[PDB]
Design an enzyme around this catalytic site. Sequence first.
Site, PDB file in Angstrom:
ATOM      1  N   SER A 184     -54.985 -47.412 -22.180  1.00  0.00           N
ATOM      2  CA  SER A 184     -53.822 -48.027 -21.557  1.00  0.00           C
ATOM      3  C   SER A 184     -53.943 -48.545 -20.126  1.00  0.00           C
ATOM      4  CB  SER A 184     -52.625 -47.073 -21.637  1.00  0.00           C
ATOM      5  OG  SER A 184     -51.525 -47.569 -20.879  1.00  0.00           O
ATOM      6  N   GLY A 185     -55.081 -48.357 -19.467  1.00  0.00           N
ATOM      7  CA  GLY A 185     -55.212 -48.865 -18.108  1.00  0.00           C
ATOM      8  C   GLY A 185     -56.539 -49.580 -17.935  1.00  0.00           C
ATOM      9  N   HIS A 209     -47.796 -48.681 -15.261  1.00  0.00           N
ATOM     10  CA  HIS A 209     -47.159 -47.996 -16.373  1.00  0.00           C
ATOM     11  C   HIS A 209     -47.865 -46.687 -16.755  1.00  0.00           C
ATOM     12  CE1 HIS A 209     -50.144 -50.524 -18.675  1.00  0.00           C
ATOM     13  NE2 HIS A 209     -50.300 -49.357 -19.274  1.00  0.00           N
ATOM     14  N   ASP A 250     -47.761 -55.054 -12.800  1.00  0.00           N
ATOM     15  CA  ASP A 250     -48.162 -53.760 -13.345  1.00  0.00           C
ATOM     16  C   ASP A 250     -49.500 -53.243 -12.811  1.00  0.00           C
ATOM     17  OD1 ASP A 250     -47.894 -51.522 -14.960  1.00  0.00           O
ATOM     18  OD2 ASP A 250     -48.639 -52.562 -16.747  1.00  0.00           O
TER      19      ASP A 250
END
Length: 220
Positions: free
Chosen positions: A175-176, A40, A88
């Site tokens: 976010s990762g 994402h 993901d």
Amino acid sequence: LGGREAEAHARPYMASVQLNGAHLCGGVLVAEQWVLSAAHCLEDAADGKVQVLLGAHSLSQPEPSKRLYDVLRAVPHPDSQPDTIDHDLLLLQLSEKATLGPAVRPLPWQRVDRDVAPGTLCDVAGWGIPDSLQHVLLPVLDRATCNRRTHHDGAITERLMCAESNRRDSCKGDSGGPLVCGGVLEGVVTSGSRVCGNRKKPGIYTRVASYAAWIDSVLA
């Protein structure tokens, strides 16, 4: 172990995936030329330049180990898509093998497909809103509780895992960012929602051990 200049960094495997020069997502160096992150992250690819910064502790301070690498290829899991939380994962190949050292070193990832024992405190690191790399030890939840804490939408499969989390985390966090237990990569965060509300939500991570064959297939 002595280099008057280059300093050691506690989490030498942390990589910053950047777009047009700004932090986009955290990632983990899993091989000399590969960094694992979330699919994402390359969502809204502003069509800008994507690079990976290694050897960084702080993104706002000069450090001798910092080095920018370009991306030769970005390999998201074949089954990942923007409207699902599954598969993901994203593997980025650097322009060249990363020069390893006190501040740059690959982290071993879990190949044994077994759950991390609930209650285990796992290290989650990343660059929040960014400055110095932030990290916290968060306890792993048993799937049962997590399923009920997600309002029971059966969103949690055996390919996913959960950790405790606060509000800021679920809105201002990297976010990762990886989830590391006992010095071994176990998970990669699946969240990127930047909307900060009062809605508390547990942390959901993709279990890397669950995609061992795929990661292996890509790095081979």
